[PDB]
Design an enzyme around this catalytic site. Structure first.
Site, short mmCIF file in Angstrom:
data_model
loop_
_atom_site.label_atom_id
_atom_site.label_comp_id
_atom_site.label_asym_id
_atom_site.label_seq_id
_atom_site.Cartn_x
_atom_site.Cartn_y
_atom_site.Cartn_z
CD1 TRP A 133 -2.59 1.64 0.45
CD2 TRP A 133 -2.17 1.76 2.64
NE1 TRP A 133 -3.36 2.66 0.98
CE2 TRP A 133 -3.12 2.74 2.32
CE3 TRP A 133 -1.74 1.64 3.97
CZ2 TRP A 133 -3.65 3.58 3.30
CZ3 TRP A 133 -2.26 2.48 4.92
CH2 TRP A 133 -3.21 3.44 4.59
CG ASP A 214 -2.39 -2.83 7.47
OD1 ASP A 214 -3.52 -2.75 7.87
OD2 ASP A 214 -1.86 -1.92 6.70
CE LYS A 250 -10.19 0.57 3.91
NZ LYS A 250 -8.80 0.36 4.45
C1 LIG Z 1 -7.67 0.81 3.93
C2 LIG Z 1 -6.36 0.30 4.35
C3 LIG Z 1 -5.82 0.63 5.63
C4 LIG Z 1 -6.58 1.57 6.60
O1 LIG Z 1 -7.35 2.62 6.07
P1 LIG Z 1 -8.16 3.55 7.06
O2 LIG Z 1 -9.20 4.29 6.32
O3 LIG Z 1 -7.16 4.56 7.70
O4 LIG Z 1 -8.80 2.72 8.12
C5 LIG Z 1 -4.61 0.14 6.06
N1 LIG Z 1 -3.96 -0.66 5.26
C6 LIG Z 1 -4.36 -1.07 4.03
C7 LIG Z 1 -3.41 -2.00 3.31
C8 LIG Z 1 -5.61 -0.56 3.59
O5 LIG Z 1 -5.98 -0.98 2.38
#
Ligand SMILES: *Cc1c(COP(=O)(O)O)cnc(C)c1O
Ligand SMILES: *Cc1c(COP(=O)(O)O)cnc(C)c1O
Lengths: 401, 401
Positions: A133, A214, A250
């Site tokens: 990410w 994560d 999500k």
């Molecule tokens: C969406 C996501 C997060 C966290 O997103 P938040 O909106 O801050 O909760 C963390 N890691 C990955 C790999 C994600 O896709």
């Protein structure tokens, strides 16, 4: 005065780019496959029913707005650890875990990052998969840690480079920090199988590394919350004390309410109480106390049988829709008479898809069909819908035949 | 594993220390003057009326839960800048300012602190008045800044040490950073008068210092939103480009929802656009995007004539409540037959009051009358009620006679 004359304009965001371009475009046939949030079958944001209920319940109560404790809502934090570890889980039952409420996944990751920077005397290196990410980099970097990488994604088969990752992990200096995505890898959609995770654990155990999980999509990936935390659990079971970030953005669609958590698995409850103390000291000077709305909502749901039953039904519905789309996309490509292998599209899990499309193919998709995505060939399945999957299949074939 | 075996228990917090203690006490007549949040004439939390209105409007609208932009909700930041700078404010009409939503005041201060660390090349020193809010130190410190101080509070008279301050400020190296409380100084309650502010501003301009205003009580201090922001305004009109942190925790009672903003006054709208891009960059890796609830409410209030009108009435209502108690405390002291000079209690502004009591006096108050406050003599005026002011005046008399 001239305090800021030397401040330059920061580079643009490519993704944001993708979106604006999608905006202008006057083709009514345009699709935004850049969207990083779920969308229902009608291309609209989706607020879960159990969420609206929890909300009306909070309302009905005339709750106050008093500051929450530094570490967050207790009912919320406990429920979060429970959701991750499992109820009859040793780590949970014996309470050797410490969980703090963070500003969604991101802030949770960040807090942990600054925790490691301050207390992990063992190393300064954080291994991230290739790719990972986008935000992962600056998070660990701004916290003041160094970045490294392990092979993960395989471009020839658009799957996992098991051979390449094992090889790389086997070679990471003892006591280093490894970052792992619990499920629904972002951005590829490539997750290891069970046998492959067993192997990964052995070696992680072996070289004595600190595992940083994560977990941003529990429940949303397969539609099964237990299934989705299998990897995390196996790791603890094997005696590996992990560190973890959870996000409810999500799975409950709590996006802008910012609900998440950061957890540390310790030797025992004593030590956990110690670790919690330093976590509070670190959090106070960052934002004082965390936002209450989102935690209250997630809490009511995890803690109220009737809403939780409903929640489970809804999340499963979300995963089911995405899965179906993946499904339909392949089946439509076969129907278009494409002769290439598209199993990776169904082998892949979660919201994102590494299509394998080349940059020139993607440019063409944009210009000719008004399908907007990133040059890496990545697509957000959420932007796909029953009413447009045919067209999308049609355009893929056309730029790839 | 033993990763955390070397992490020690963090030291216990004293404020938390007094409420905890306050809780365990069986005295029916006990009082908690350690509370850092408004309370009504009934010792209860107050969710404003307009706030409740705002929330149901929000509820009627059936709004989504989609992420806000990194910088926050546009109507909230605009509105937030307007309230501080003033509507026909040069700086505001010209667009030479940049406002970003933060996680309440603390979060905003932290973002500010972190921006200074990164781009303020002229100096790492941050000058804090003696004394200042406890959280100010770790805030700047964790950001990477050095801390310094200037005289401010005269302990001899329980008022401003204007001389020591001017003397001190004159000497601060040019281009250093100076932190100032806009009104309702925390924790003393001591604010300079208008005349003293002109003089401070004239020296501040001279020395080419970067002023950082911490505004967490606009409207809440005098009950007048213009008056409470006079100093901030005067500095700007004096050609001083300041930096500011705003909080909606008290004036709106949004405490746990965490609504606030950080603002930078720049030379021109072009320079602001640049400063805004660098703030977004610094923000993403902290928490991605801010929490939506508080901002939604606050924007709605600021933005609907009908709710602003009510908000004003309500906030006056709160400041008036505090003024009254200070007045009442003084008068009841007089009439008990106290001969000490207690004028400071009325001269002081705000929810906090430095009484001048000595630790040993504070100790008596606790053991004998069940009045819980911090050893430094600081009392939270919000914990005083029309039905206990009498009990408070008598106890103070008994311990000081
Ligand atoms: C969406 C996501 C997060 C966290 O997103 P938040 O909106 O801050 O909760 C963390 N890691 C990955 C790999 C994600 O896709
Ligand atoms: C209350 C307060 C703040 C901000 O508090 P938040 O809850 O973080 O909004 C900042 N500075 C001072 C001096 C305060 O008293």
């Amino acid at each position: 005065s001239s305090w800021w004359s030397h401040v330059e304009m920061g580079p643009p965001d490519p993704i944001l780019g993708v979106t604006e371009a999608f905006k202008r475009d006057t083709n009514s046939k345009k699709m935004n496959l850049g969207v990083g949030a779920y969308r229902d079958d009608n291309g609209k944001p989706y607020v879960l029913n159990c969420v609206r209920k929890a909300e009306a319940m909070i309302a009905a109560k005339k709750m106050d707005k008093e500051y929450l404790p530094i570490a967050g809502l207790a009912d919320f934090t406990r429920a979060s650890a429970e959701l991750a570890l499992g109820e009859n889980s040793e780590a949970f039952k014996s309470g050797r875990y410490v969980t703090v409420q963070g500003i969604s996944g991101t802030g949770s990751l960040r807090v942990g990052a600054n925790f490691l920077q301050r207390f992990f005397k063992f190393s300064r290196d954080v291994y991230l998969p290739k790719p990972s990410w986008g935000n992962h980099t600056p998070i660990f970097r701004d916290a003041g840690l160094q970045l490294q990488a392990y092979r993960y994604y395989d471009p020839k088969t658009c799957s996992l480079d098991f051979t390449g990752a094992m090889e790389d992990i086997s070679k990471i200096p003892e006591k280093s920090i490894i970052l792992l995505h619990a499920c629904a890898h972002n951005p590829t959609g490539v997750d290891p199988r069970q046998e492959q995770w067993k192997e990964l654990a052995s070696v992680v155990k072996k070289r004595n590394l600190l595992a940083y999980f994560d977990m941003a999509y529990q429940g949303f990936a397969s539609g099964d919350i237990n299934r989705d935390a299998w990897a995390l659990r196996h790791f603890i079971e094997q005696g590996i004390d992990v560190v973890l970030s959870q996000s409810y953005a999500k799975n409950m669609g709590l996006y802008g309410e910012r609900a998440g958590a950061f957890t540390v698995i310790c030797r025992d409850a004593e030590e956990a109480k110690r670790v919690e103390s330093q976590l509070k000291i670190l959090i106070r000077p960052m934002y004082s106390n965390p936002p209450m709305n989102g935690a209250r909502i997630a809490s009511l749901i995890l803690n109220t049988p009737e809403l939780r039953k409903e929640w489970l039904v809804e999340v499963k519905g979300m995963a089911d829709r995405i899965i179906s789309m993946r499904t339909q996309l392949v089946s439509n490509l076969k129907k278009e008479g494409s002769s290439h292998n598209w199993q990776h599209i169904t082998d892949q899990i979660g919201m994102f898809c590494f299509t394998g499309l080349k940059p020139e193919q993607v440019e063409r998709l944009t210009k000719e069909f008004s399908i907007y995505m990133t040059k890496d060939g990545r697509i957000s399945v959420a932007g796909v819908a029953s009413s447009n999957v045919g067209y999308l299949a049609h355009a893929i074939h056309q730029v790839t035949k």
